[PDB]
Scaffold this active site. Structure first.
Site: not given
Ligand SMILES: *[C@@H]1O[C@H](CO)[C@@H](O[C@@H]2O[C@H](CO)[C@@H](O[C@@H]3O[C@H](CO)[C@@H](O)[C@H](O[C@H]4O[C@H](CO)[C@@H](O)[C@H](O)[C@@H]4O)[C@@H]3O[C@@H]3OC[C@@H](O)[C@H](O)[C@H]3O)[C@H](O)[C@H]2NC(C)=O)[C@H](O[C@@H]2O[C@@H](C)[C@@H](O)[C@@H](O)[C@@H]2O)[C@H]1NC(C)=O
Ligand SMILES: *[C@@H]1O[C@H](CO)[C@@H](O[C@@H]2O[C@H](CO)[C@@H](O)[C@H](O)[C@H]2NC(C)=O)[C@H](O[C@@H]2O[C@@H](C)[C@@H](O)[C@@H](O)[C@@H]2O)[C@H]1NC(C)=O
Ligand SMILES: *[C@@H]1O[C@H](CO)[C@@H](O[C@@H]2O[C@H](CO)[C@@H](O)[C@H](O)[C@H]2NC(C)=O)[C@H](O[C@@H]2O[C@@H](C)[C@@H](O)[C@@H](O)[C@@H]2O)[C@H]1NC(C)=O
Ligand SMILES: [Ca+2]
Ligand SMILES: [Ca+2]
Length: 272
Positions: A126-128, A85
């Protein structure tokens, strides 16, 4: 105060109805939409609960409706630890907002993955990937709520080291209703030995953001965050909760995740 919990990422954690029937949770984050943006067909992952891509998750509508009948808000969580994503442009952000409105919120699509019942909003986990245009995504969701006269709640899940690379721009829009700061998997700011660094981060950094409700995000058990941050329930009650409750927009505790919450929320709820 409220308790928010993540559900979706372990098929053995119980049904959504059973999760709501604990009466421990005020907000359920359903994770995760693991592919979206950059002209992809979005992909929803509810691990072994049900397969969204083959239309076997529409039954969840009735359980979402039941959760909402108890005053529980239900959000769809974008992103998570593993995914494909990212947003490629302002127009891409608007296209994803429309997809979310049409497929999960109050709009219509050719096939809504979880059935007809509208979710209450969107959680940004949102982590990456690229950090760009999540501010625009939040703004376009806010507009979609206004256009249809419906509440679209916006929530964000940054990690505790301030400012968060992925979410600082989104949070700086001042449009987020909820921000649960993850005080785990980062020994620079999470509970380690004692709560000094956690409280300093909370009081000095996260207090400065504009959000209506600021939540302390925690692992529900040591196994939920092998990288650290679990706080034994009695220590949370005696060392942390009474301090952070002095913050004007203290909203409660967020827990990762339902699968690991055998009795943590039951032990802390009266003091949250
Ligand atoms: C919240 O938790 C933090 C993380 O655990 C604490 O910070 C740590 O505190 C320890 C203990 O003070 C620090 O370790 C010391 O470091 C100094 C500097 O090198 C050493 O000289 C000292 O060793 C001496 O004392 C020992 C007894 O404590 C003796 O065994 C030793 O022989 C020496 O006589 C001590 O070093 C430790 O010694 C014991 C070993 O088991 C251990 O491996 C070894 O590290 C540590 O450096 C510190 N960590 C950080 C990242 O700062 C924190 O403690 C308080 O707050 C910090 C900011 C400092 O002011 C500390 O001095 C203070 O104790 C704690 N905070 C609260 C409020 O509880
Ligand atoms: C839904 O998310 C799960 C957790 O990220 C995926 O499982 C993980 O898939 C990885 C490959 O992309 C694999 O290396 C990991 O070991 C695995 N983790 C766990 C805890 O199972 C899952 O991927 C599907 O299921 C796994 C078991 C493999 O068969 C993959 O090829 C599958 O795509 C995600 N489901 C979907 C449909 O993407
Ligand atoms: C949130 O957005 C603000 C702008 O709407 C940021 O402040 C602006 O930061 C610019 C570059 O950092 C600086 O040139 C501008 O003067 C400043 N604008 C104003 C009105 O102050 C803000 O950045 C944080 O706050 C400023 C004051 C500096 O300390 C920056 O170093 C900070 O990062 C944005 N906040 C965050 C957390 O990103
Ligand atoms: Ca409909
Ligand atoms: Ca202790």
């Amino acid at each position: 105060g409220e308790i928010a919990i993540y559900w979706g990422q372990d098929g053995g954690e119980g049904s959504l109805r059973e999760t709501c029937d604990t009466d421990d949770y005020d907000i359920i984050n359903i994770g995760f939409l693991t592919t979206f943006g950059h002209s992809t067909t979005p992909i929803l992952n509810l691990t072994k609960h049900c397969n969204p891509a083959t239309s076997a998750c529409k039954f969840l509508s009735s359980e979402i409706s039941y959760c909402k009948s108890k005053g529980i808000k239900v959000f769809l969580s974008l992103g998570g630890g593993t995914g494909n994503y990212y947003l490629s442009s302002r127009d891409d952000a608007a296209s994803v907002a429309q997809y979310l409105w049409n497929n999960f919120l109050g709009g219509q699509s050719e096939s809504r993955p979880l059935g007809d019942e509208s979710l209450d909003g969107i959680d940004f986990d949102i982590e990456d990937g690229s950090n760009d245009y999540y501010d625009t995504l939040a703004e376009q969701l806010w507009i979609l709520g206004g256009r249809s006269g419906s509440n679209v709640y916006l929530a964000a899940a940054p990690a505790c080291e301030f400012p968060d690379y992925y979410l600082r721009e989104a949070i700086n829009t001042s449009l987020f209703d909820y921000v649960w700061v993850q005080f785990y998997n980062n020994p620079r700011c999470h509970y380690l030995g004692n709560a000094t660094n956690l409280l300093n981060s909370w009081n000095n950094d996260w207090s400065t953001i504009l959000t209506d409700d600021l939540f302390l995000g925690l692992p529900a058990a040591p196994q939920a965050a092998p990288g650290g941050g679990f706080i034994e329930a009695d220590d949370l009650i005696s060392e942390v909760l009474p301090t952070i409750k002095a913050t004007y927009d203290y909203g409660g505790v967020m827990l990762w995740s339902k699968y690991y919450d055998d009795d943590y929320s039951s032990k802390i709820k009266p003091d949250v």
